[PDB]
Amino acid sequence: MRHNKKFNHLGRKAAHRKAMLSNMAASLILHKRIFTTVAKAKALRIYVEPLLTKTKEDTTHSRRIAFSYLQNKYALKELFGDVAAKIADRPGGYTRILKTGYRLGDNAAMCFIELVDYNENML
Amino acid sequence: PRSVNHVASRAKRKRILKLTRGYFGARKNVWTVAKNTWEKGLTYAYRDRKSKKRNFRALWIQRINAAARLEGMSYSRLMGALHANGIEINRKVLADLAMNHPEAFRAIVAKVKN
Amino acid sequence: ARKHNSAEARKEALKQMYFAKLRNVPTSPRKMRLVADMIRGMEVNRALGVLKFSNKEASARVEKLLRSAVANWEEKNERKAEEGELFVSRICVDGASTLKRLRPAPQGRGYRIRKRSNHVTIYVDTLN
Amino acid sequence: AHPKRRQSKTRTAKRRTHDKAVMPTLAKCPNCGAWHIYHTVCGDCGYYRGKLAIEKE
RNA sequence: UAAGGGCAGACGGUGGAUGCCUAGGCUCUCGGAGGCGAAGAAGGACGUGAUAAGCUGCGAAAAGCUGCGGGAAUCGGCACA
RNA sequence: ACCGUGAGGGAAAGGUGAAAAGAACCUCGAACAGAGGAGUGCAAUAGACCCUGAACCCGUCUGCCUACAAGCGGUAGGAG
RNA sequence: AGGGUAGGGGUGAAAGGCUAAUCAACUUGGAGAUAGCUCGUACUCCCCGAAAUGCAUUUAGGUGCAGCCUGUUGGAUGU
RNA sequence: UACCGAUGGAGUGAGGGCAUGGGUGCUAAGGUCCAUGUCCGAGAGGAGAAGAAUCCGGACCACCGGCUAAGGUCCCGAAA
RNA sequence: UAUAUCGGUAGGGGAGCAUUCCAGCGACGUAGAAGGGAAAAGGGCGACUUUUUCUGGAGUUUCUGGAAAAGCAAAUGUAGGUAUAAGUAACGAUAAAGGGGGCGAGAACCCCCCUCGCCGAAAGACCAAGGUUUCCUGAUCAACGCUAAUCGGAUCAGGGUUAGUCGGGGCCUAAGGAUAAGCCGAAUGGCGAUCCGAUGGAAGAACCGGUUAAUAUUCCGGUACUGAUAC
RNA sequence: AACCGCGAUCUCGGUGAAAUUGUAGUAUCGGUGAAGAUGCCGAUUACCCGCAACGGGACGAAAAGACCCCGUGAACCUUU
RNA sequence: GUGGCACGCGAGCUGGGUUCAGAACGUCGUGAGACAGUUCGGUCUCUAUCUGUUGUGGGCGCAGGAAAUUUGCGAGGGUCU
């Protein structure tokens, strides 16, 4: 049974899962759109929106809290620079997941996840 | 000289396998299975040629019994009366008349109804 | 002259058939047959879409075979096919030659591995 | 552990009754006029629900 | 209503049986001959071609050198040059 | 060839066509991967694993039967 | 690392351990040893048709001779 | 109707059930050892629900003819 | 012509069919032989035999007699081929991966970058044994690689290993081995003090720096040293 | 006994064995029987085809029982 | 409580006992060895085909197509003190 257990383990030990989520979040902040598996993107969304919300408080404390998750200074600088001003005054829902197709090697369901405010065509 | 009867040896099997068409699964075409099935069937056929005579006589007797009961008699009483009167019509003809020529069966019954 | 006459009859007969063949495809005949049964009897454009987006690996080769069959039809009828005009009227998958390999097993035993191939035949025709 | 008998062709085929390839869920996208998988990005034009999602140069 | 299945026919697939074929064996007959080697044998190694040599031939004169006799138009060995 | 330290043990494997005339060129396809043509040839369903091309085994099509039925699967009757 | 001991022979702080995945060795030959034991033995139709007892046997699941079958012949006698 | 002579070829020399007369055993055994018949062995067909030798009966082949045996005649299942 | 008879295991007797080849006599065949598929008919009875048609494309056959490598359903029988279990077990250490670009017809896996993780008296760097071209490059992705592959210790071709000083050998002997003079012994031979034989002893003798896709104390620039040889 | 983590497991894409195998449309009960029946008899129950899970039966699989006896079989060991 | 179910149940477990190669004691035997005996140590293999059982689906049927709510032919559970 897994009644009301609300996060995906993603076939990994806990430390590996946390490291993978951190790497994905840095990649998504640096390049505004990434291509992944659907399950990984759905897990990343829950991981990464609180981190983007934390930029609404422009403080050293919030910067340090965000760095404790990221551990990447380039990603932190970009996030508290351009990404913050872009996602300012948006009440949640900063990301979007769209399904694309299937891989050749293992038939994995593929998608892209992107920051919403960097897709001008979708507004 | 060296003699191997390849063609005759294969032709024997092919002739027998033409006879096992219609069987179920491997029994139609696998040869050891098929040849086994076909011989048991031949023993059955010998037995059933004998049993067919008993089966058809039983069918005739049942039809004669029904027609005699329609006329008012039973089979045993009717056949006793026919034998006493010396009528030699066999059960095959009597059953045929009972099924298809009821007036003729009725006249036969009326002959010995006394 | 006997075989020449028989060959001439067969050559005349082939002019009215529109088909393509794939021979010695190094993959499982059973797995290929799944795809064949999926697309048997289906209109050609829908079949091309189905094969393009199918989740089986064999569909990729079946799609190119189907395109070749449509091209053969077009050449033999001397005109381009229209929309919804052609359909997959026949398709079959046969087994072909097997490569035999040896794989080691515990305690010094060796087991045989079969790498199977298949043939595929596709006939197209009009929905008349 | 071990099969007492080989299975007949009939028994094997009866078990294989439920072995089938799955049809993909295909939508038409009447604008571009070609097939794509429902609830995915139309890979040719790069559109999705009438909006350019992926731009290809 | 056939998801599938059974039987028959037709037509294919696989596989390589059968039939036909073969100088490769087997058993002999007749007539010879019955050894090779320190003038270095049998059996090998390495080489040798216009082009890599797997066989064949040959041995730094290396698919060959000389003479006599025979013969008369192609030849430069075999593995589809 | 392969196997074994060694002495030693020890396989499988023949056939296009009369003649390579062994398929110029076209089509689908990234590709001869493969095929459909054209052409050669008495014949290519003789296309290189190539004479003939059986069985087991594997498919497709057509006809009939089959989802209330229980044992060597045939045999003898018998509608549609 | 090199060397030596070789088949009932070697070697054994002794377990019948080890002696090339083999130990109350391997290869080739005598050799197609022997096996009163087990298994197997392939086209057709026709006629006839047993025995599982006695005697002997280092014999007892083997065999010899009677008994009982069959073919061909000559005699009368069998029930 | 095939009993003896002489000759050619054998196989068998693990038997079993039933009835009868006995030994042994416990007047046990689908036990065991002899004797006299019989059947299975090497024997199909019928009745007994289904049973190697209990009851009837010895199958050249065919028949969609008839009479019977043991045993049966309300239905399954032939016949009151 | 009648009568009688005709169940059968071990087993005895009789009469036949097919197969390969031979002799004699007849025949057939590119206007289609053998073989293979289908169909029909026949036989006191049967083993089997005729005929038609398709495939096939070159040999076959009747009768009489002769001779045998003269007939398969089972031997946990043998070879080859193909099934069933089954699209099942499994894909070989639970050190672990994520993203962005590149190339490509095709990318989870190839190349580059960033991040993450594992070893670190090793899972880093060397010598020897053993292997023997696996090294580097260009083409190739059929087979091999437990998936795919544009990649590879894979296939094909080309290239690549440079010494007076490093290692070995040349020199010496150990165990042991082969022998001389001799000894022993049916034969083949067995022993037996100089020679062979490293795993040991001598070797006559350097380093620094640079350079290749692939070699370097070997090539080059310096700096040195050692052995023989002609004054 | 409860709960937790990863690997295996389950589902999907790719590759793809083995032991075993007379043919099978392979139900239950009690009888019967070479004496312990999926397959015989009489009843009973049961629409056709999968998947996951467990091991009661198929005298389940494997190795021509090593115990026991037998063969005028064999080897090795002991000894007046 | 007493019994049956291969003294129920090892393709379900175990391995204390029992069947095996080592060793020791008592006893017997000239000895090799042996036992109405004792003692310490001593590998428990198999991926479930059919049937069976526990769950869970697909197909068709039920007068043509359906969404709901239901009766109960029957089956199983419950039954202690």
Ligand SMILES: [K+]
């Ligand atoms: K040909």
Ligand SMILES: [K+]
């Ligand atoms: K020819």
Ligand SMILES: [K+]
């Ligand atoms: K064929």
Ligand SMILES: [K+]
């Ligand atoms: K039937």
Ligand SMILES: [K+]
């Ligand atoms: K005696």
Ligand SMILES: [K+]
């Ligand atoms: K007796």
Ligand SMILES: [K+]
């Ligand atoms: K011939």
Ligand SMILES: [K+]
């Ligand atoms: K066996």
Ligand SMILES: [Mg+2]
């Ligand atoms: Mg897991």
Ligand SMILES: [Mg+2]
């Ligand atoms: Mg009668």
Ligand SMILES: [Mg+2]
């Ligand atoms: Mg493959």
Ligand SMILES: [Mg+2]
């Ligand atoms: Mg795919």
Ligand SMILES: [Mg+2]
């Ligand atoms: Mg090994």
Ligand SMILES: [Mg+2]
């Ligand atoms: Mg399935």
Ligand SMILES: [Mg+2]
């Ligand atoms: Mg059908």
Ligand SMILES: [Mg+2]
């Ligand atoms: Mg065929």
